[PDB]
């Protein structure tokens, strides 16, 4: 018989288990015997209080390092404002020790947890690359709750070495199964930020996770975008509960907030899924999230059904993560077919954007070639354009099966005149759809202002497979 955690704050962890059932359904996974045994998770942040009474038991020196100080000890730097408590809070959500009479428990309370101190200083390309590529064969899951400024004005992503780290980890990590990179989608909601302008969340190598309030609403800090994959509960308004976890100075907090609480919760759930099936590839994992995530009890004004019958939202991706379902579908899962990559140049001749622009192109998705795709995974719309007031633009991509993905919504604070340079807006909304047919790109000036610009390049990159059998 399964006896749930006896930790003092477990009852307050409403998102792990609630009397209303509106939770991450992890208890169902725990009951089946999945709690993270044998799985290693690393938090890429400002360090981890490795001697914390609720972390020490699961602490793993091998999943830790201090890149900022080029030393193995990831201990955070203490300050009056407790500025470097971020990493520790995330660690607890993934693997805080269970049944030890302290604070609460992590989603994967039997997993090993490590930390990489890399945000407490200049976060260079080399720093990110060393963090993302730390112990690719020991660490299974990396949890990153950080990214470019969420001011709703910036467009930034990984540089050369980090980009290499991402692909290298996805190709060689976990003995070739691929490192699993979980990312927080962003807290720039109030600034109307778009996570598609965040190269880390927008990457196909990461599982970008958004948040939902206790009552299933879009949090005030939530950024909408088509690259988000799934959601996890987190903080909301003044009347909604928040996340319970380990805090600096060996304390316990009941007020962790933002998408930073959602990413580690997702990492924990992904840790349970890996225990249930250690052979899942980085892609297999994303497939499981897409198939099991539940859009139920999550309120949004943009729930739309895609070409394969699944509901998707720019605020929640495919919905709330379901630990029970994840673990269930993972067990006897058949690893997906080899990944194909179809590159198609849509437009060579420049194109005036003006007030509105529509680009339609018939795509065969590499028919007759080795990279022919009939089952989509990630889709990138690589745009290079010049415009006078970037934030006034709204860009949409419509798949042949009619799924309309918002690649970029208006950002009122973005006054840049820089445009975009081969920026790969990515959408997960057409996952599993057949890419053959007519694609449509829509670019429009959402303002009444006399703006102007030119679309000089539009490359559609399709990732996916082809329905085989043998």
């Amino acid at each position: 018989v399964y006896q749930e955690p006896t930790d003092p704050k477990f009852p307050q962890q409403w998102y792990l288990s609630g009397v209303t059932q509106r939770d991450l359904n992890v208890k169902e996974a725990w009951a089946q015997g999945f709690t993270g045994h044998g799985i290693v998770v690393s938090i890429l942040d400002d360090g981890i209080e490795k001697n914390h009474p609720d972390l020490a038991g699961n602490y793993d020196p091998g999943a830790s390092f201090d890149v900022n100080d080029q030393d193995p000890d990831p201990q955070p730097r203490y300050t009056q404002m407790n500025d470097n408590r971020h990493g520790t809070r995330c660690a607890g959500e993934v693997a805080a020790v269970a049944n030890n009479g302290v604070c609460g428990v992590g989603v994967a309370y039997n997993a090993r947890i490590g930390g990489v101190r890399m945000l407490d200083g200049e976060v260079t390309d080399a720093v990110e690359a060393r963090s993302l590529g730390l112990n690719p064969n020991h660490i299974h899951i990396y949890s990153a709750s950080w990214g470019p400024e969420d001011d709703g004005k910036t467009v930034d992503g990984p540089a050369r070495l980090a980009e290499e780290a991402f692909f290298r980890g996805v190709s060689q990590g976990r003995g070739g199964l691929g490192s699993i990179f979980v990312w927080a989608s962003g807290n720039g909601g109030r600034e109307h930020d778009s996570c598609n302008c965040d190269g880390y969340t927008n990457s196909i190598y990461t599982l970008s996770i958004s948040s939902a309030t206790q009552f299933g609403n879009v949090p005030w800090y939530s950024e909408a975008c088509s690259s988000t994959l799934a959601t996890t509960y987190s903080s909301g308004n003044q009347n909604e509960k928040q996340i319970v976890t380990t805090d600096l100075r060996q304390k316990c907090t009941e007020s962790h907030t933002g998408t930073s609480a959602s990413a580690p919760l997702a990492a924990g759930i992904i840790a349970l899924t890996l225990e249930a099936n250690k052979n899942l590839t980085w892609r297999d994992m994303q497939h499981l999230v897409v198939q099991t995530s539940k859009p139920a009890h999550l309120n949004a004004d943009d729930w739309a059904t895609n070409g394969v019958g699944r509901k998707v939202s720019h605020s929640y991706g495919y919905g709330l993560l379901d630990a029970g379902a994840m673990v269930a579908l993972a067990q006897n899962w058949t690893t997906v077919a080899p990944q194909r990559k179809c590159i198609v140049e849509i437009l060579v001749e420049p194109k005036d954007i003006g007030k509105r622009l529509e680009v339609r192109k018939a795509v065969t998705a590499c028919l007759g070639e080795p990279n022919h795709i009939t089952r989509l995974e990630h889709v990138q719309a690589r745009l290079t354009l010049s415009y006078n007031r970037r934030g006034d633009l709204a860009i949409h991509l419509i798949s042949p099966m009619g799924t309309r993905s918002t690649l970029l919504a208006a950002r009122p604070h973005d006054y840049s005149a820089d445009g975009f340079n081969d920026w790969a807006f990515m959408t997960t909304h057409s996952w599993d759809e057949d890419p053959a047919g007519e694609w449509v790109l829509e670019i429009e000036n959402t303002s009444e202002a006399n703006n102007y610009g030119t679309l000089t390049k539009f490359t559609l990159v399709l990732y996916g497979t082809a329905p085989e059998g043998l």
């Binding site: 942040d45 400002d46 976060v123 709750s145 950080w146 470019p148 400024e149 933002g258 930073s260």
Partner: peptide
Amino acid sequence: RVKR
């Protein structure tokens, strides 16, 4: 880079 900002923490979330």
